[PDB]
């Protein structure tokens, strides 16, 4: 996949975001933007040039679900990679994002090398 | 059911 893919990394906890942000820089993505809900992140969207995103489930406004829905549905983003972050593994959550179209599913906290795994079965998958 | 949710991420290529 291309080193300039632009991500962003959706997290109402300014910290994760960081955090993500520096496991990505460290995995040579340097170019990333941040958004703190579905809502923040939908209008920098609008932008345009975004090649990828990885959202938390929980956060106001709108959560990491129906951001994810919102985006699958759209006319011009439906195709855009989503990975989607949670607090814990559960049935009812994974198979949640399957059903919604997540392109991956990571539990928090996650070293660099998860991360890289998980981009990289992404990456795979739509022959980026 | 660890490994229902293990088999489960393994079959959406998760």
Same mark, same amino acid.
């Given at each position: 996949?291309?080193?300039?893919?632009?991500?962003?990394?959706?997290?109402?906890?300014?910290?994760?975001?960081?955090?993500?942000?520096?496991?990505?820089?460290?995995?040579?993505?340097?170019?990333?933007?941040?958004?703190?809900?579905?809502?923040?992140?939908?209008?920098?969207?609008?932008?345009?040039?975004?090649?990828?995103?990885?959202?938390?489930?929980?956060?106001?406004?709108?959560?990491?679900?129906?951001?994810?829905?919102?985006?699958?549905?759209? $006319?011009?983003?439906?195709?855009? +990679?989503?990975?989607?972050? @949670?607090? !814990?593994? #559960?049935?009812?959550? =994974?198979?949640?994002?399957?059903?919604?179209?997540? $392109?991956?599913?990571?539990?928090? +906290?996650?070293?660099?090398? @998860?991360? !890289?795994? #998980?981009?990289?079965? =992404?990456?795979?998958?739509?022959?980026? | 059911?660890?490994?229902?949710?293990?088999?489960?991420?393994?079959?959406?290529?998760?």
């Amino acid at each position: 996949a291309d080193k300039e893919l632009k991500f962003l990394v959706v997290d109402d906890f300014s910290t994760m975001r960081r955090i993500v942000r520096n496991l990505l820089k460290e995995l040579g993505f340097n170019n990333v933007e941040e958004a703190e809900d579905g809502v923040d992140a939908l209008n920098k969207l609008q932008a345009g040039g975004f090649g990828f995103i990885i959202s938390d489930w929980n956060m106001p406004n709108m959560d990491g679900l129906e951001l994810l829905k919102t985006i699958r549905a759209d $006319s011009a983003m439906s195709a855009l +990679p989503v990975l989607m972050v @949670t607090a !814990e593994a #559960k049935k009812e959550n =994974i198979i949640a994002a399957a059903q919604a179209g997540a $392109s991956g599913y990571v539990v928090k +906290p996650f070293t660099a090398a @998860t991360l !890289e795994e #998980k981009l990289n079965k =992404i990456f795979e998958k739509l022959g980026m | 059911s660890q490994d229902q949710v293990d088999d489960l991420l393994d079959s959406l290529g998760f």
